[PDB]
Amino acid sequence: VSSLQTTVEADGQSSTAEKSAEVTENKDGVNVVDTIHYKGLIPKQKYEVVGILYEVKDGKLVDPNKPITISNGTGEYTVSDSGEGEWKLNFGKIDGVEARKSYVVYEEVTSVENLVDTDNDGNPDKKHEVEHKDPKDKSQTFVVK
């Protein structure tokens, strides 16, 4: 049993569940970072992260097949001893973040090792996969002025 909660930071402005960060169009691009608060991951195991930034309007993806940007971060993430903790994914300074529009971060977390036995043969045969893909999550959304 596992989950991710995520917090987007756009040009130093952090979103919350209550209130999305507001930024001005940057021209040099908007710096986008996502904090991944993970729960119930397998302790001490290595995972890979794919973060995806989408344009969003009224809690629906505008163009779900055309992400603004995709980040793989450092390429490997280590779970805490408790299975709960935080990782930070940098997207970098992102072009195509436009005035009057909102953007939401989606996250996919996948174990490096097979950790899930799906057929009860006693051997893990599947990677552990956890995601947070919520287009209504203010915590993952920022607004451009």
Residues that bind Mg ion (CB under 5 A): 117, 119, 121, 123, 125
- What Å distances lie between residue 120 and 11, 21, 42, 117, CA to CA? 48, 46, 18, 6
123 is in an annotated binding site: yes
Nearest to Mg ion of 75, 122 (CB atom): 122
121 is in an annotated binding site: yes
Q: How many CA atoms lie within 13 A of 95 on its CB side?
A: 1
CB of 78 to Mg ion, least distance (A): 24
119 is in an annotated binding site: yes
Q: Which residue is nearest to Mg ion (CB)?
A: 125
CB of 121 to Mg ion, least distance (A): 4
**3-state DSSP call for residue 138?**
helix
Would you state the structure tokens that stand for residue 138, as one six-digit string? Answer: 């203010």
Burial letters 4-39, b for 16+ CB under 10 A, else e: bbbbbbbbeeebeeeebbebeeeeebbbbbbbbebe
Nearest to Mg ion of 7, 111 (CB atom): 111
Nearest to Mg ion of 65, 118 (CB atom): 118
CB of 128 to Mg ion, least distance (A): 13
d(CA 70, CA 82): 29
CA angle 77, 79, 81 (to 5 degrees): 155
Nearest to Mg ion of 28, 121 (CB atom): 121
CB of 132 to Mg ion, least distance (A): 27
Binding residues for Mg(2+): 117, 119, 121, 123, 125
Binding residues: 117, 119, 121, 123, 125
